[PDB]
Amino acid sequence: LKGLSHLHILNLESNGFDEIPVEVFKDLFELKIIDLGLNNLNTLPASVFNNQVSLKSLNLQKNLITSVEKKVFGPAFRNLTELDMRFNPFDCTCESIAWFVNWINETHTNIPELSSHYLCNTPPHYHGFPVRLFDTSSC
RNA sequence: CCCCCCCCCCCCCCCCCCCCCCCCCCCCCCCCCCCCCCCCCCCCCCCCCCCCCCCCCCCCCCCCCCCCCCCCCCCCCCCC
């Protein structure tokens, strides 16, 4: 993907990806839509979406993602229009989704089916509970 | 100067088997859209038929009144 300065739409859905190299998206400054759903992604390297300063739509549904952290999704979640991370095994813990749930609480990005398909998986106390109802007052 | 036999390690290639990953096809279930047919409920429309009510018309019947015509009967007076 190097040198594709004018790339706008990238679709990499359902390729079986387990890990993403940190510097695969570094040249894609004008990228607006990236689709990475239906892969096997769980852990992402930090600063992998740093150069995506014009990203408007991120799709990561039906992956194995458990934690959404600022060091990875910070620049990606800056100015979005649509977010799609629905069917993921979210780990509802203060070090996994606390920044993400705070971001969900105040944001203008459209997140469809937020109250139904964003469900905790672990710990068993939270299994099945909505991610948006996680309480961060004791973090 | 010259062959053969063992040892370790590195390989190459052809098969077998097991793994993840993906594609295509199919099956099961569910959902959505469309089409067709059918049932149920309610509000109606038009037409036909039957019945009833009101009003009116025409005809007829019964009774009564008026006029005209006709007939009978009673008083009274003259003419020859």
CSV table of N, CA and C in Angstrom, one decimal, chain A residues 4-135:
chain,number,residue,atom,x,y,z
A,4,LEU,N,0.5,5.2,-2.3
A,4,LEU,CA,-0.9,5.5,-2.8
A,4,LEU,C,-1.4,6.7,-2.0
A,5,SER,N,-0.8,7.9,-2.5
A,5,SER,CA,-1.2,9.1,-1.8
A,5,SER,C,-2.6,9.6,-2.0
A,6,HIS,N,-3.2,9.3,-3.2
A,6,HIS,CA,-4.5,9.7,-3.5
A,6,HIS,C,-5.6,8.7,-3.2
A,7,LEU,N,-5.2,7.5,-2.6
A,7,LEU,CA,-6.2,6.5,-2.3
A,7,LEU,C,-7.3,7.0,-1.3
A,8,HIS,N,-8.5,6.7,-1.6
A,8,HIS,CA,-9.6,7.2,-0.8
A,8,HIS,C,-10.4,6.1,-0.1
A,9,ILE,N,-10.7,5.0,-0.9
A,9,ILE,CA,-11.5,3.9,-0.4
A,9,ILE,C,-10.6,2.6,-0.4
A,10,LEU,N,-10.5,1.9,0.7
A,10,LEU,CA,-9.8,0.7,0.8
A,10,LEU,C,-10.7,-0.3,1.5
A,11,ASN,N,-10.8,-1.5,0.8
A,11,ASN,CA,-11.6,-2.6,1.3
A,11,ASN,C,-10.7,-3.8,1.5
A,12,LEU,N,-10.6,-4.2,2.7
A,12,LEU,CA,-9.8,-5.4,3.1
A,12,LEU,C,-10.5,-6.4,3.9
A,13,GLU,N,-11.8,-6.5,3.7
A,13,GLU,CA,-12.7,-7.3,4.5
A,13,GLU,C,-12.5,-8.8,4.2
A,14,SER,N,-12.6,-9.6,5.2
A,14,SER,CA,-12.6,-11.0,5.1
A,14,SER,C,-11.3,-11.5,4.3
A,15,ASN,N,-10.2,-11.2,4.9
A,15,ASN,CA,-8.9,-11.8,4.4
A,15,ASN,C,-8.2,-12.7,5.4
A,16,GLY,N,-8.8,-12.9,6.5
A,16,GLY,CA,-8.2,-13.7,7.6
A,16,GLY,C,-7.1,-13.0,8.3
A,17,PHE,N,-6.9,-11.7,8.3
A,17,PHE,CA,-5.9,-11.0,9.0
A,17,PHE,C,-5.9,-11.3,10.5
A,18,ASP,N,-4.8,-11.6,11.0
A,18,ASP,CA,-4.6,-11.7,12.5
A,18,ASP,C,-3.9,-10.5,13.1
A,19,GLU,N,-2.9,-10.0,12.4
A,19,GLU,CA,-2.1,-8.8,12.8
A,19,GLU,C,-1.9,-7.9,11.7
A,20,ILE,N,-1.7,-6.6,12.0
A,20,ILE,CA,-1.5,-5.5,11.0
A,20,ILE,C,-0.1,-5.0,11.3
A,21,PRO,N,0.8,-4.9,10.3
A,21,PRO,CA,2.0,-4.2,10.5
A,21,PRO,C,1.8,-2.7,10.8
A,22,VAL,N,2.7,-2.2,11.6
A,22,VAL,CA,2.4,-0.8,12.1
A,22,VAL,C,2.5,0.2,11.0
A,23,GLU,N,3.3,0.0,10.0
A,23,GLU,CA,3.5,1.0,8.9
A,23,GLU,C,2.9,0.6,7.6
A,24,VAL,N,1.8,0.0,7.6
A,24,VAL,CA,1.1,-0.3,6.3
A,24,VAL,C,0.3,0.8,5.7
A,25,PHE,N,-0.2,1.7,6.6
A,25,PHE,CA,-1.1,2.8,6.2
A,25,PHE,C,-0.4,4.1,6.3
A,26,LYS,N,0.9,4.2,6.3
A,26,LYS,CA,1.6,5.4,6.6
A,26,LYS,C,1.5,6.4,5.5
A,27,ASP,N,1.4,6.0,4.2
A,27,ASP,CA,1.3,6.8,3.1
A,27,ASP,C,-0.1,7.2,2.7
A,28,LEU,N,-1.1,6.7,3.3
A,28,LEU,CA,-2.5,6.9,2.9
A,28,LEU,C,-3.0,8.1,3.7
A,29,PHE,N,-2.6,9.3,3.3
A,29,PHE,CA,-3.0,10.5,4.0
A,29,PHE,C,-4.4,10.9,3.6
A,30,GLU,N,-4.9,10.7,2.4
A,30,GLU,CA,-6.2,11.1,2.0
A,30,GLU,C,-7.2,10.0,2.1
A,31,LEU,N,-6.9,8.9,2.8
A,31,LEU,CA,-7.8,7.8,2.9
A,31,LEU,C,-9.1,8.3,3.7
A,32,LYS,N,-10.2,7.9,3.2
A,32,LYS,CA,-11.5,8.3,3.9
A,32,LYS,C,-12.3,7.2,4.4
A,33,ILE,N,-12.3,6.0,3.6
A,33,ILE,CA,-13.1,4.9,4.0
A,33,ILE,C,-12.2,3.7,4.1
A,34,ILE,N,-12.1,3.0,5.2
A,34,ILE,CA,-11.3,1.7,5.3
A,34,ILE,C,-12.2,0.7,5.9
A,35,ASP,N,-12.3,-0.5,5.3
A,35,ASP,CA,-13.1,-1.6,5.7
A,35,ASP,C,-12.2,-2.8,6.1
A,36,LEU,N,-12.3,-3.2,7.3
A,36,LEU,CA,-11.5,-4.3,7.9
A,36,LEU,C,-12.3,-5.3,8.6
A,37,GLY,N,-13.6,-5.4,8.4
A,37,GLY,CA,-14.5,-6.3,9.1
A,37,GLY,C,-14.3,-7.7,8.6
A,38,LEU,N,-14.9,-8.6,9.4
A,38,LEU,CA,-14.9,-10.1,9.1
A,38,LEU,C,-13.5,-10.7,9.0
A,39,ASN,N,-12.5,-10.0,9.6
A,39,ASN,CA,-11.2,-10.6,9.8
A,39,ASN,C,-11.0,-11.2,11.1
A,40,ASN,N,-9.8,-11.6,11.5
A,40,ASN,CA,-9.5,-12.2,12.8
A,40,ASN,C,-8.6,-11.3,13.6
A,41,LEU,N,-8.8,-10.0,13.5
A,41,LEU,CA,-8.0,-9.0,14.2
A,41,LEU,C,-8.4,-8.9,15.7
A,42,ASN,N,-7.4,-9.0,16.6
A,42,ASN,CA,-7.6,-8.8,18.0
A,42,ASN,C,-6.7,-7.7,18.5
A,43,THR,N,-5.4,-7.7,18.3
A,43,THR,CA,-4.5,-6.7,18.8
A,43,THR,C,-3.9,-5.9,17.7
A,44,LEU,N,-4.0,-4.6,17.8
A,44,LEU,CA,-3.5,-3.7,16.8
A,44,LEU,C,-2.3,-2.9,17.3
A,45,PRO,N,-1.2,-2.7,16.5
A,45,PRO,CA,-0.1,-1.9,17.0
A,45,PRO,C,-0.5,-0.5,17.2
A,46,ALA,N,0.2,0.1,18.1
A,46,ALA,CA,0.0,1.5,18.4
A,46,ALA,C,0.4,2.4,17.2
A,47,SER,N,-0.2,3.5,17.1
A,47,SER,CA,0.1,4.5,16.0
A,47,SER,C,0.0,3.9,14.6
A,48,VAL,N,-1.0,3.0,14.4
A,48,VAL,CA,-1.2,2.4,13.1
A,48,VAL,C,-2.2,3.2,12.3
A,49,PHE,N,-3.0,4.1,12.9
A,49,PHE,CA,-3.9,5.0,12.2
A,49,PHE,C,-3.4,6.4,12.3
A,50,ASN,N,-2.1,6.7,12.6
A,50,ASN,CA,-1.7,8.0,12.9
A,50,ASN,C,-1.8,9.0,11.7
A,51,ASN,N,-1.5,8.5,10.5
A,51,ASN,CA,-1.5,9.3,9.3
A,51,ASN,C,-2.9,9.4,8.7
A,52,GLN,N,-3.9,8.7,9.1
A,52,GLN,CA,-5.2,8.8,8.6
A,52,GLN,C,-5.9,10.0,9.2
A,53,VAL,N,-5.5,11.2,8.7
A,53,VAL,CA,-6.0,12.5,9.2
A,53,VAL,C,-7.3,12.9,8.5
A,54,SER,N,-7.8,12.2,7.5
A,54,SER,CA,-9.0,12.5,6.8
A,54,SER,C,-10.0,11.3,6.8
A,55,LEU,N,-9.8,10.4,7.7
A,55,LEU,CA,-10.6,9.2,7.8
A,55,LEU,C,-12.0,9.6,8.2
A,56,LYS,N,-13.0,9.1,7.4
A,56,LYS,CA,-14.4,9.4,7.7
A,56,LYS,C,-15.3,8.2,8.0
A,57,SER,N,-14.8,7.0,7.7
A,57,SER,CA,-15.6,5.8,8.0
A,57,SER,C,-14.6,4.6,8.3
A,58,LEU,N,-14.8,4.0,9.4
A,58,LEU,CA,-14.0,2.9,9.8
A,58,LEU,C,-14.9,1.7,10.1
A,59,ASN,N,-14.6,0.5,9.5
A,59,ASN,CA,-15.4,-0.7,9.7
A,59,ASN,C,-14.5,-1.8,10.2
A,60,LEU,N,-14.8,-2.3,11.4
A,60,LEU,CA,-14.1,-3.3,12.1
A,60,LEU,C,-15.0,-4.4,12.7
A,61,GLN,N,-16.2,-4.6,12.1
A,61,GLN,CA,-17.2,-5.5,12.7
A,61,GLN,C,-16.7,-6.9,12.6
A,62,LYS,N,-17.3,-7.8,13.4
A,62,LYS,CA,-17.1,-9.2,13.4
A,62,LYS,C,-15.6,-9.6,13.4
A,63,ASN,N,-14.8,-8.9,14.1
A,63,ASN,CA,-13.5,-9.3,14.4
A,63,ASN,C,-13.4,-9.9,15.8
A,64,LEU,N,-12.2,-10.1,16.3
A,64,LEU,CA,-11.9,-10.6,17.6
A,64,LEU,C,-11.4,-9.5,18.5
A,65,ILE,N,-11.8,-8.3,18.3
A,65,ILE,CA,-11.3,-7.2,19.1
A,65,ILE,C,-11.9,-7.2,20.4
A,66,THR,N,-11.1,-7.1,21.5
A,66,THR,CA,-11.6,-7.0,22.9
A,66,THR,C,-11.4,-5.7,23.5
A,67,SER,N,-10.3,-4.9,23.2
A,67,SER,CA,-10.1,-3.7,23.9
A,67,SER,C,-9.9,-2.6,22.8
A,68,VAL,N,-10.5,-1.4,23.0
A,68,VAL,CA,-10.3,-0.3,22.2
A,68,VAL,C,-9.6,0.8,23.0
A,69,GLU,N,-8.4,1.1,22.6
A,69,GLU,CA,-7.5,2.0,23.3
A,69,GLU,C,-7.1,3.2,22.5
A,70,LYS,N,-6.8,4.3,23.3
A,70,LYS,CA,-6.5,5.6,22.7
A,70,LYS,C,-5.2,5.5,21.8
A,71,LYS,N,-4.2,4.7,22.2
A,71,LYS,CA,-3.0,4.7,21.5
A,71,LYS,C,-3.1,4.1,20.1
A,72,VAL,N,-4.2,3.4,19.8
A,72,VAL,CA,-4.5,2.8,18.5
A,72,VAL,C,-5.5,3.6,17.8
A,73,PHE,N,-6.7,3.8,18.4
A,73,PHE,CA,-7.8,4.4,17.8
A,73,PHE,C,-8.0,5.9,18.0
A,74,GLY,N,-7.0,6.5,18.7
A,74,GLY,CA,-7.1,7.9,19.0
A,74,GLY,C,-7.2,8.7,17.7
A,75,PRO,N,-6.2,8.7,16.9
A,75,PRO,CA,-6.2,9.5,15.6
A,75,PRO,C,-7.3,9.0,14.7
A,76,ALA,N,-7.7,7.7,14.7
A,76,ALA,CA,-8.7,7.2,13.8
A,76,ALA,C,-10.1,7.7,14.2
A,77,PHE,N,-10.3,7.9,15.5
A,77,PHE,CA,-11.6,8.3,16.0
A,77,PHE,C,-11.7,9.8,16.1
A,78,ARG,N,-10.8,10.6,15.5
A,78,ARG,CA,-10.8,12.0,15.7
A,78,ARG,C,-12.0,12.7,15.1
A,79,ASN,N,-12.2,12.6,13.8
A,79,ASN,CA,-13.3,13.2,13.1
A,79,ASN,C,-13.9,12.1,12.2
A,80,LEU,N,-14.8,11.3,12.7
A,80,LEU,CA,-15.4,10.3,11.9
A,80,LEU,C,-16.9,10.7,11.6
A,81,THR,N,-17.5,10.0,10.7
A,81,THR,CA,-18.9,10.0,10.4
A,81,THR,C,-19.6,8.8,10.8
A,82,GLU,N,-19.0,7.6,10.5
A,82,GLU,CA,-19.6,6.3,10.7
A,82,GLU,C,-18.5,5.4,11.4
A,83,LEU,N,-19.0,4.7,12.4
A,83,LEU,CA,-18.1,3.7,13.1
A,83,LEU,C,-18.9,2.3,13.1
A,84,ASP,N,-18.2,1.3,12.8
A,84,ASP,CA,-18.8,-0.1,12.7
A,84,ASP,C,-17.9,-1.1,13.4
A,85,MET,N,-18.1,-1.4,14.6
A,85,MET,CA,-17.4,-2.4,15.4
A,85,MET,C,-18.3,-3.3,16.1
A,86,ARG,N,-19.4,-3.7,15.5
A,86,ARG,CA,-20.5,-4.3,16.2
A,86,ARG,C,-20.2,-5.6,16.9
A,87,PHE,N,-20.0,-6.7,16.1
A,87,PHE,CA,-20.0,-8.0,16.7
A,87,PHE,C,-18.6,-8.4,17.1
A,88,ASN,N,-18.1,-7.8,18.2
A,88,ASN,CA,-16.8,-8.1,18.8
A,88,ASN,C,-16.9,-8.5,20.2
A,89,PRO,N,-16.0,-9.3,20.7
A,89,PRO,CA,-16.0,-9.7,22.1
A,89,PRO,C,-15.3,-8.7,23.0
A,90,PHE,N,-16.0,-7.6,23.3
A,90,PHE,CA,-15.5,-6.5,24.1
A,90,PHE,C,-15.3,-7.0,25.5
A,91,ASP,N,-14.1,-6.7,26.0
A,91,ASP,CA,-13.8,-7.0,27.4
A,91,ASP,C,-14.1,-5.7,28.2
A,92,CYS,N,-15.2,-5.8,29.0
A,92,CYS,CA,-15.7,-4.6,29.7
A,92,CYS,C,-14.9,-4.5,31.0
A,93,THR,N,-13.7,-3.8,30.8
A,93,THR,CA,-12.8,-3.5,31.9
A,93,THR,C,-12.3,-2.1,31.8
A,94,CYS,N,-11.9,-1.5,32.9
A,94,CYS,CA,-11.4,-0.2,32.9
A,94,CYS,C,-10.2,0.1,32.1
A,95,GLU,N,-9.4,-1.0,31.7
A,95,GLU,CA,-8.3,-0.8,30.9
A,95,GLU,C,-8.5,-1.3,29.4
A,96,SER,N,-9.7,-1.6,29.1
A,96,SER,CA,-10.0,-2.1,27.7
A,96,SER,C,-10.9,-1.2,27.0
A,97,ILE,N,-12.0,-0.7,27.6
A,97,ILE,CA,-13.0,0.1,26.9
A,97,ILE,C,-13.3,1.4,27.6
A,98,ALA,N,-12.6,1.7,28.7
A,98,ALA,CA,-12.9,2.9,29.4
A,98,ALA,C,-12.8,4.2,28.6
A,99,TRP,N,-11.7,4.4,27.9
A,99,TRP,CA,-11.6,5.5,26.9
A,99,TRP,C,-12.6,5.4,25.8
A,100,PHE,N,-12.8,4.2,25.3
A,100,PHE,CA,-13.8,4.0,24.2
A,100,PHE,C,-15.2,4.3,24.7
A,101,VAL,N,-15.6,3.9,25.9
A,101,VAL,CA,-17.0,4.2,26.3
A,101,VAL,C,-17.1,5.7,26.7
A,102,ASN,N,-16.1,6.3,27.2
A,102,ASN,CA,-16.1,7.7,27.4
A,102,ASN,C,-16.3,8.5,26.0
A,103,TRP,N,-15.5,8.0,25.0
A,103,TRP,CA,-15.7,8.6,23.7
A,103,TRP,C,-17.1,8.4,23.1
A,104,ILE,N,-17.7,7.2,23.4
A,104,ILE,CA,-19.0,7.0,22.9
A,104,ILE,C,-20.0,7.9,23.6
A,105,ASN,N,-19.8,8.2,24.8
A,105,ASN,CA,-20.7,9.0,25.6
A,105,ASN,C,-20.8,10.4,24.9
A,106,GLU,N,-19.7,11.0,24.5
A,106,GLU,CA,-19.7,12.3,23.8
A,106,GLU,C,-19.0,12.1,22.5
A,107,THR,N,-19.8,12.1,21.4
A,107,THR,CA,-19.3,12.0,20.1
A,107,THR,C,-20.4,12.3,19.1
A,108,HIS,N,-20.0,12.7,17.9
A,108,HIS,CA,-21.0,13.0,16.8
A,108,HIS,C,-21.0,11.9,15.8
A,109,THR,N,-20.1,11.0,15.8
A,109,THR,CA,-20.0,9.9,14.8
A,109,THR,C,-21.2,9.0,15.0
A,110,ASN,N,-21.8,8.6,13.8
A,110,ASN,CA,-22.9,7.7,13.8
A,110,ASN,C,-22.5,6.3,14.1
A,111,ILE,N,-23.1,5.7,15.1
A,111,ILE,CA,-22.8,4.3,15.5
A,111,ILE,C,-24.1,3.5,15.5
A,112,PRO,N,-24.5,3.0,14.4
A,112,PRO,CA,-25.8,2.2,14.4
A,112,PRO,C,-25.7,1.0,15.3
A,113,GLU,N,-26.9,0.6,15.8
A,113,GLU,CA,-27.0,-0.6,16.7
A,113,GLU,C,-26.1,-0.6,17.8
A,114,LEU,N,-25.8,0.6,18.4
A,114,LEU,CA,-24.9,0.7,19.5
A,114,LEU,C,-25.5,0.0,20.8
A,115,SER,N,-26.8,0.1,21.0
A,115,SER,CA,-27.3,-0.4,22.3
A,115,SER,C,-27.7,-1.8,22.2
A,116,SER,N,-27.5,-2.5,21.1
A,116,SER,CA,-27.9,-3.9,21.0
A,116,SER,C,-26.7,-4.8,20.6
A,117,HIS,N,-25.9,-4.4,19.7
A,117,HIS,CA,-24.9,-5.3,19.1
A,117,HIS,C,-23.5,-5.0,19.7
A,118,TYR,N,-23.3,-4.0,20.6
A,118,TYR,CA,-22.0,-3.8,21.2
A,118,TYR,C,-22.2,-4.3,22.6
A,119,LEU,N,-21.9,-5.6,22.8
A,119,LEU,CA,-22.1,-6.3,24.0
A,119,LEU,C,-20.8,-6.8,24.6
A,120,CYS,N,-20.7,-6.7,25.9
A,120,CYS,CA,-19.5,-7.3,26.6
A,120,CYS,C,-19.5,-8.8,26.5
A,121,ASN,N,-18.3,-9.3,26.5
A,121,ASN,CA,-18.0,-10.7,26.5
A,121,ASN,C,-17.4,-11.2,27.8
A,122,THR,N,-16.4,-10.5,28.3
A,122,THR,CA,-15.7,-10.8,29.5
A,122,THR,C,-15.7,-9.5,30.3
A,123,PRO,N,-15.7,-9.5,31.7
A,123,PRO,CA,-15.8,-10.7,32.6
A,123,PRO,C,-17.2,-11.3,32.6
A,124,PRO,N,-17.4,-12.5,33.1
A,124,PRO,CA,-18.7,-13.1,33.1
A,124,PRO,C,-19.7,-12.3,33.8
A,125,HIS,N,-19.3,-11.4,34.7
A,125,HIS,CA,-20.3,-10.5,35.3
A,125,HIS,C,-20.9,-9.6,34.3
A,126,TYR,N,-20.2,-9.1,33.3
A,126,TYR,CA,-20.7,-8.3,32.2
A,126,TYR,C,-21.1,-9.0,31.0
A,127,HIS,N,-21.0,-10.3,30.9
A,127,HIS,CA,-21.3,-11.0,29.7
A,127,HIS,C,-22.7,-10.7,29.2
A,128,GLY,N,-22.7,-10.2,27.9
A,128,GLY,CA,-24.0,-9.8,27.3
A,128,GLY,C,-24.5,-8.4,27.6
A,129,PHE,N,-23.8,-7.7,28.6
A,129,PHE,CA,-24.3,-6.4,28.9
A,129,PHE,C,-23.8,-5.4,27.8
A,130,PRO,N,-24.6,-4.3,27.6
A,130,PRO,CA,-24.2,-3.4,26.6
A,130,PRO,C,-22.9,-2.7,27.0
A,131,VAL,N,-22.0,-2.4,26.0
A,131,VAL,CA,-20.8,-1.7,26.3
A,131,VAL,C,-21.1,-0.3,26.7
A,132,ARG,N,-22.0,0.4,26.1
A,132,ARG,CA,-22.3,1.8,26.5
A,132,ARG,C,-22.8,2.0,27.9
A,133,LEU,N,-23.3,0.9,28.5
A,133,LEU,CA,-23.8,1.0,29.9
A,133,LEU,C,-22.7,0.7,30.9
A,134,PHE,N,-21.5,0.5,30.5
A,134,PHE,CA,-20.3,0.3,31.4
A,134,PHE,C,-20.1,1.6,32.2
A,135,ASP,N,-19.9,1.4,33.5
A,135,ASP,CA,-19.7,2.5,34.4
A,135,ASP,C,-18.3,2.8,34.6
